[PDB]
Design a protein around this ligand. Structure first.
Ligand code: DB8
Length: 296
């Protein structure tokens, strides 16, 4: 409990890494620590703002180190204090607990400076959300199957290690070349059975597994969230944040006016993923064993 520890009320960048990686000093072509500009300002070309919110901002950048494109998430304002700092840095630890996997967004490096946290990842293609916005309609099933398979591979990787993502949604699944995708955004990720029993942040209510209302955390939660993610993109169906419709989607209801055009096979898989009872809900590994989800 950092809130009662003597850690309160206390200029150069410091690498953030939990996996262990001395040194903690940063260097780059274009960077002179005696100049007042931040490491981020000096060491990257800032090309565009990919996203923003209460957390801060995500930029498309070009690295002066290697000339390659990356995404960098920069927190909004200096750490509020020790708990805030620990919570934000925990994202780097999580992203590292996941480690390298072809269906997970890769973290290149992370650092803090002036109370600001910076996470540099590979630059991916558009999020599934962006892609569906651009399509302006339901996605063809041939695309959907590939996205379902790849995100299930990512989840099987997390879940085998007792990690739960807790915010699977169209906005943090990113398209790559020829129909592949990657899961990102490990800021809410939890390792089951690691204190505190609480401390848990809540994902987007539209995709939240019903058992989380009772505080019942487990890997099954992500399967449900991916189920609704795929339902949304396959049907161009806006998901309720609450009310009767929110309840219905968590009672096995598939709205006919949105879902009647699904193949029987995709409908059958979604029903397995959207099972209200997490004890009965299919696991990612079990789904990937189905012949319909075999390597195409
Ligand atoms: C760096 O850190 C983090 C970054 C992210 N988010 C992203 C990651 C990752 N990771 C990777 N790659 C991304 C690529 C994106 O856009 C690509 C296409 C943009 N084009 C804009 C112009 N139009 C016309 C065409 C499409 C993007 O946009 C929102 C967000 C990305 C998250 Cl979710 C968490 C953390 Cl911690």
């Amino acid at each position: 409990d950092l809130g009662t520890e003597n850690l309160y009320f206390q200029l150069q960048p410091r690498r953030v890494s939990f996996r262990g990686e001395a040194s903690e000093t940063l260097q780059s072509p274009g960077y002179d620590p005696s100049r007042p500009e931040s490491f981020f300002q000096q060491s990257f070309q800032r090309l565009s703002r990919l996203g923003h919110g209460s957390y801060g901002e995500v930029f498309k950048v070009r690295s002066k180190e290697d000339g390659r494109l990356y995404a960098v998430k920069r927190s909004m304002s200096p750490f509020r204090g020790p708990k805030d700092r620990a919570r934000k840095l925990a994202e780097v630890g999580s992203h590292e607990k996941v480690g390298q996997h072809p269906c997970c967004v890769r973290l290149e490096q992370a650092w803090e400076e002036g109370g600001i946290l910076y996470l540099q990842t590979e630059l991916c293609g558009p999020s599934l959300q962006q892609h569906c916005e651009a399509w302006g309609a339901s996605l063809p099933e041939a695309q959907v199957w590939g996205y379902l398979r790849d995100t299930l591979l990512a989840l099987a990787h997390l879940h085998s290690q007792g990690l739960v993502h807790l915010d699977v949604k169209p906005a943090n699944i990113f398209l790559g070349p020829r129909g592949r995708c990657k899961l990102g955004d490990f800021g809410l990720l939890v390792e089951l059975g690691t204190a505190g029993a609480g401390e848990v942040q809540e994902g987007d209510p539209r995709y939240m597994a019903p058992e989380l209302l009772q505080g019942s955390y487990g890997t099954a939660a992500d399967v449900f969230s991916l189920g609704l993610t795929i339902l949304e993109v396959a049907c161009n169906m806006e998901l309720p944040h609450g009310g009767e419709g929110w309840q219905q989607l968590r009672q096995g209801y598939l709205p006919p006016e949105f879902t009647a055009g699904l193949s029987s096979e995709l409908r059958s898989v979604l029903v397995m993923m959207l099972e209200p009872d997490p004890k009965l809900r299919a696991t990612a590994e079990a789904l990937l064993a189905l012949p319909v989800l075999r390597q195409p």
